[PDB]
C-alpha cells in the first residue's frame, strides 16, 4: 500500500516546506488542506480511519502544522480524540517547524553537555516564543533549571506556567527588558539558548565570552544580526575559549534530517503520536 | 502515461476517504478540487479532455463526491455534457459514498434475503443524505415499496422527489421527529435500513427485535453509538432471533472492494461511467 | 530525490490542464496553490529553496500559471526576486498556455518562412490577448514589422507599449472594427496571425488569399467558426496556392510537446527561467 500523508494545516494554505521534507522522508503523496480546525477535522480523521485494514492501517499518517501553534495543537487535540479504539493512524505535530527545531537544537547541547544537564541552570532568552518554550520544555524534562526570559514579566509567566502544565515540569520565568538584563540574567548560566525573532540580536559575544560558568550556547535566528554575537550561524559546537556554540544553521541541519526522518517513522505503524517529547527521543538518536 | 484521478467534490474541500481509495484503487496521482459547481467543472473537464491522445486518453478520469447527492448528480451531468464525441475520458460519481455503500448495503441485503425484495416493504431512517437516498433508489429499483424517511418532511419529499425522477420510482417520503416515530415507521416493514449521520443511535434493539415482519436490518454508521441497537458494526448476515443484521463494518469491507475496483476500471478505457446503475450492478456480482 | 512541481495559479484554484502536462513532462509529484499573488508566494518560494541542498536543489521547481498573464507576470517576477546566490530553482511562466501557444505558433512560422523573418511586415489580428501578444513579441525579436490589431486603438496601444517594454522591442498597433478593417490592414503583410478569442472569425478567405505579399497565415482559434477562413484546424504548413496556413490544432499539438518538454527542462538545472524568451528557443528547435 501506499504512503499517503495527510497534511492539516491551520493557515489559509498548506506549507511547501512541510510538502517538501514530507516527500524526502518518504511518503508516496502529500494531500495538504489548509483552514483545519477542530471542528472540520473530524471528517478528514475518518478518511484515514475507515479507508484501510490491518496491515494496511499503518500507511496512511497525519502531520498538522502551520504558523500558530496553539492553533496546532488544538487541532492535534482534535485528531487525536477522533481515533478510538484500533481506528487511528500515526500523527505529528510541527507547526512552523518549532517542534523539530527545539528537538534538535536541545539534543546537540545536551550531547555536548556530555549527555547530562540536570541540576544546572539553563537560560532560554527571548523564550516565549513556540521554540523557546519548546526548548524550556524538553530541557526541564532533562533536569535543567530553566529560565524562560522575555521582554515582560506577565508573558514570558504564561509561557511557563502553559509549558509546566503540557509538560509537568517546573520552568521558571524572568523579565529581561533590555541588553543589560539579558546579559544578568545568563551569570551563573551553563547552558544558554537563544530563541528570539529573526534577525535580532539578543546576547552580544561579551556577555557570554567571559562568564565562567557557560559551558554551551545555542542560537536559533539564521538572519544576521544572529541572536549570539561572536558566533557564525553554521557553527556546530565550535570551541569559543572552552565554551562550544551552536548556530542556527548547524542546529537547522539536524532539524531537517529529523523532521524526514519523524515522517519515516509514521508509516511504521498506525500508533505513533511524534509531538515535542518523541520527536526529541529521536533527535537524540539522530544528535 | 500515469494514471491521473481529477476529483471533483461539491464540498468545501476535497474527501480524505475519497484520496485514500483512489490511491487503493490504483491512481497514480490524485489532484482535488472543493467548491466544484455545474458552472465551473466545464473547465476542469477541458483540462482532462484536451491534454492526452490516442492510448493515453483513458489514463486520465474523474471522480465526483462531495456531501450533497442533489449537487453531485448536477456536477456528474456538467461533466457528461461537456464530453462530446471521443473527447471524453471514463468518469465515476460516488458523492460520499453514496453509490458504493448503498449498492454494498442493499446487495448484501437483497442476496441474503434469497434474490428478491420485490413487493415488500423498505425503509429508509435518515435517508436524506447520500447514502440514504442511493439505498432507496436502489430498493425501489428492485421493486421494494421504499419509505425514505426524515426528521423533516419537505426535506424528505425533496429527497424522495429526487430518487423518484433520477430513477423513474415511486419512493414515499414520511416525518420521523423522534424515536417513537421511526419505531413506528418500521412496523410492517421486512428491510430496515439506518443511514443516519455517523455516531447516531436511530433504532434501539425494542425497535426492531419484536416487529415479526422485518427480516433483515442493515446500519451504514460505523461510530458507536451504532445506528441499530444490539448488533455488532462487523454483523454480515449474524442471527437475531428470526432475523439477519448487517452493520457498518460488514457493509464496508464490500463498499471498499467496490469502490477500488471502480477506480481501477476508470483507466482500462475512456468511456466508462460508474454511477448507481454501473455500481450497483457491480456490486450483485461481488456481494 | 522525487521531482516535485510547485504550481502557482493566479486563479481560484490550479488549472487541471496544467497538471496533467506537468505530469506528462516527467514531474513527479504536482503540489498546486491558488490564489497566488506576489505578496504570498514569497514563502511558498522559501519552501522551495530552504528544504533540499547540493544536488538534490534541481529537483524542485516552480510553475506559474492561471488566467491573467499580467497576474501571472506579476507573480514570476516575485519568484525571482526571492532568490539569491544559489539558492534558487528553476522556473517556468506559462498562464493560460500562452507562452508555450505563442512560441508554438511562431517558431513553425518563422521555421516554414525559411528561418528568417526580418525586415518583413507581420499582422496579429486581435493580438491584444496574451497569445497574440506573446506572438508579436516573438516576431518582433526575430525582426518583423509587426503590427499588432484590435477593435479600439487605445487598448491596442497599450498592448503594443507593454510589449515592447517588455521585451525591448517597437511593435505597433492599429484599430480594426470590423471584417473590411482587418482585410485593409492585412495588405503588404507576409505573415498573418489570428489571435482571437475562441469561436470568432476574424479573417475571411477572400481576405488573404488574394494579398500577393502574404506568405503564411496561422490561426490559434480551434473552435468554428474559425479565426481564418479557408482552412483547416488542423493544417501545418498545408499549401494554399503559393501560400501556406497552420490551423489552431498544428499549432496546439507543437504547444502540447513544448509544453512538456520544458517541464522536463526544470529539473535539469536549478536556474532554468522559461518565460517567452527561452520557451520560444526550445519552440524553434522543436518545430
Ligand atoms: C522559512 C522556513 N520555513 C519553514 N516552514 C516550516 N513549516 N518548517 C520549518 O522548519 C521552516 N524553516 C526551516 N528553515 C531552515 C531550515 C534549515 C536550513 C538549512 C540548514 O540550517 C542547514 O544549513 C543545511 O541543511 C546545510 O546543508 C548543507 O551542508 C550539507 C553538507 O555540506 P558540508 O558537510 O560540507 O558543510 C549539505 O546538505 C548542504 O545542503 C535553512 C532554513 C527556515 C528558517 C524556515
Ligand atoms: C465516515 C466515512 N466517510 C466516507 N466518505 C466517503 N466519501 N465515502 C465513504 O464511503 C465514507 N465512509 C465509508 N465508511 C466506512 C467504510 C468501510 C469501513 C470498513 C473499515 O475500513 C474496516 O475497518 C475494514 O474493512 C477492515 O478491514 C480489515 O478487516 C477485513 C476482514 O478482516 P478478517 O476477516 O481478517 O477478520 C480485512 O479486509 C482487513 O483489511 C468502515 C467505514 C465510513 C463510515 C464513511
Ligand atoms: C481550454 C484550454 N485550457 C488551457 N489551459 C492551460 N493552462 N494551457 C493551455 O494551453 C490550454 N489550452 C490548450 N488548448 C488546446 C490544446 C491542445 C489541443 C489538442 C492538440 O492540438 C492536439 O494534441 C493536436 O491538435 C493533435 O496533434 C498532435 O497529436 C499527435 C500525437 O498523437 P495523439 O496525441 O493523438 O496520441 C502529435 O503528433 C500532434 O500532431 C486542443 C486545445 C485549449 C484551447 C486550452
Ligand atoms: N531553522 C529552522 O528550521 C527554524 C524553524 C522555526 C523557527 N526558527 C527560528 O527560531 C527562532 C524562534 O522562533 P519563534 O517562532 O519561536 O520566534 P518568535 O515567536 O517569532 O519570537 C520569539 C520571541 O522573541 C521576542 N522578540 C520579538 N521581538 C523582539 C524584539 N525587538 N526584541 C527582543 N525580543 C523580541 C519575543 O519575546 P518577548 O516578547 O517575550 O520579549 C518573542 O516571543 C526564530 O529566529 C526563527 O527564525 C528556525
Ligand atoms: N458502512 C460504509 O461503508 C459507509 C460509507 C459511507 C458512509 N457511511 C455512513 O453512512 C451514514 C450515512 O451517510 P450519509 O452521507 O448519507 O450521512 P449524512 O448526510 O451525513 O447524514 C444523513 C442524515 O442523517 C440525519 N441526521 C443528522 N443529524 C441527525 C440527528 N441528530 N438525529 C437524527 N438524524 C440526523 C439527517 O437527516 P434529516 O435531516 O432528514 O433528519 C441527514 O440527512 C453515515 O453515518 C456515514 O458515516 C458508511
Ligand atoms: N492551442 C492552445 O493550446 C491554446 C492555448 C491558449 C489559447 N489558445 C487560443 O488562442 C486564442 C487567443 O487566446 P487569448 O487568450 O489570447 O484570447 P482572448 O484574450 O480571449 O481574446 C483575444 C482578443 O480577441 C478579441 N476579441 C474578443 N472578442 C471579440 C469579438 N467579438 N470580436 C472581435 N474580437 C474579439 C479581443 O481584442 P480586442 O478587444 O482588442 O478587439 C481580445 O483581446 C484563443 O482562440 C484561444 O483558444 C490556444
Redesign the interface.
Request: aromatic share 20%.
Given at each position: 500500500?501506499?504512503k499517503?500523508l495527510?497534511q492539516f494545516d491551520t493557515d489559509a494554505?498548506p506549507?511547501?516546506?512541510?510538502?517538501?521534507?514530507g516527500?524526502?522522508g518518504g511518503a508516496d503523496?502529500?494531500?495538504?488542506?489548509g483552514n483545519v480546525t477542530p471542528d472540520?477535522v473530524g471528517?478528514?480523521?475518518?478518511?484515514?480511519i475507515?479507508?484501510?485494514?490491518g496491515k494496511?492501517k499503518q500507511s496512511?499518517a497525519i502531520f498538522v502544522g502551520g504558523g500558530d501553534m496553539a492553533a496546532g495543537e488544538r487541532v492535534f487535540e482534535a485528531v487525536k480524540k477522533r481515533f478510538?479504539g484500533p481506528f487511528r493512524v500515526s500523527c505529528m505535530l510541527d507547526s512552523n517547524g518549532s517542534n523539530t527545531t527545539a528537538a534538535a537544537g536541545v539534543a546537540l547541547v545536551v550531547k555536548a553537555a556530555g549527555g547530562s544537564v540536570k541540576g544546572k541552570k539553563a537560560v532560554v532568552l527571548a523564550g516565549t516564543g513556540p521554540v523557546g518554550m519548546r526548548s524550556a520544555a524538553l530541557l526541564a524534562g532533562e533536569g535543567a533549571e530553566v529560565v524562560l526570559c522575555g521582554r515582560k514579566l506577565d508573558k514570558a509567566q504564561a509561557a511557563a506556567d502553559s509549558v509546566n502544565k503540557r509538560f509537568k515540569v517546573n520552568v521558571t520565568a524572568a523579565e529581561t527588558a533590555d541588553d543589560a538584563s539579558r546579559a544578568e540574567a545568563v551569570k551563573g548560566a551553563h547552558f544558554v539558548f537563544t530563541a528570539g525573532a529573526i534577525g535580532l540580536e539578543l546576547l552580544p559575544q561579551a556577555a557570554w565570552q567571559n562568564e565562567s560558568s557557560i559551558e554551551i550556547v545555542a542560537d536559533y535566528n539564521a538572519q544576521p544580526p544572529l541572536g549570539i554575537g561572536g558566533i557564525d550561524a553554521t557553527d556546530k559546537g565550535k570551541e569559543y575559549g572552552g565554551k562550544r556554540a551552536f548556530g542556527a544553521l548547524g542546529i537547522g541541519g539536524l532539524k531537517?534530517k529529523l523532521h524526514r526522518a519523524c515522517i519515516a517513522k509514521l508509516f511504521e505503524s498506525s500508533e505513533g503520536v511524534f509531538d515535542a517529547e518523541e520527536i526529541y527521543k529521536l533527535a537524540k538518536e539522530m544528535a
Open positions: 500500500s501506499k499517503l495527510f494554505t506549507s511547501v516546506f512541510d510538502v517538501v521534507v516527500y524526502d503523496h502529500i494531500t495538504g488542506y472540520n471528517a478528514y480523521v475518518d478518511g484515514t475507515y479507508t484501510r485494514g494496511e496512511t478510538f531537517l
